[PDB]
């Protein structure tokens, strides 16, 4: 509409958005069974 001309990529945005929540997601899991969340310490 606008000068959205950058295309507001629907199939970028919405498809790297995921992305973002692909990686941090399964990143978050990972740390958490090697124990990293576990925070040493105790």
């Known amino acids: 509409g606008e000068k959205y001309k950058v295309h507001n990529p629907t199939p970028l945005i919405v ?3 995921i ?4 990686l941090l997601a399964l990143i978050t899991a990972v740390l958490y069974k090697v124990g990293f969340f576990k925070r040493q310490y105790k």
Do not use: A, D, N
Request: charge should be neutral; charged fraction near 0%; glycine fraction near 42%.
């Open 15 to 17: 498809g790297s958005s």
């Open 19 to 22: 992305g973002g929540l692909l």
